Write a protein that binds this ligand. Structure first.
Ligand code: NAG
Lengths: 68, 49
């Protein structure tokens, strides 16, 4: 492959070639961004659902100095 | 200890008081607090003063 057609300056990641190499372009790759702005999720919900993921597996809470 | 207000718990200062009761010998001293009520009048009663 020619070195200047790989998606970035050095060919380190091929991640910008997805729009040319997508297998089935008539199927939307799943994207939940509209369901976040339809339920009025603030800045704090994204971390509080993240803290509930880690307490789900058996890991400690955030340290409560973490929030201020 | 260089204490700072932005220090995670377990690094913030705790004040401690250790009470140590040491008996020995005597005739009497401090003890519990007794209870009471409202004495009456003109009625056979069982009293403690
Ligand atoms: C973590 O925090 C939640 C409330 O924020 C609490 O209900 C839960 O018990 C905490 N986890 C532990 C292990 O105490």
């Amino acid at each position: 492959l020619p070195a200047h057609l790989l998606g970035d300056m050095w060919g380190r990641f091929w991640t910008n070639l997805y729009s040319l190499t997508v297998p089935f372009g008539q199927k939307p790759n799943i994207d939940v961004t509209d369901a976040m702005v339809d339920q009025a999720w603030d800045a704090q919900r994204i971390f509080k659902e993240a803290e509930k993921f880690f307490v789900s597996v058996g890991l400690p809470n955030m340290t409560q100095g973490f929030w201020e | 200890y260089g204490f700072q207000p932005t220090n995670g718990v377990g690094y913030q200062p705790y004040r401690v008081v250790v009470l140590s009761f040491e008996l020995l010998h005597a005739p009497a001293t401090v003890c519990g607090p007794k209870k009471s009520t409202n004495l009456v009048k003109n009625k056979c009663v069982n009293f403690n003063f």
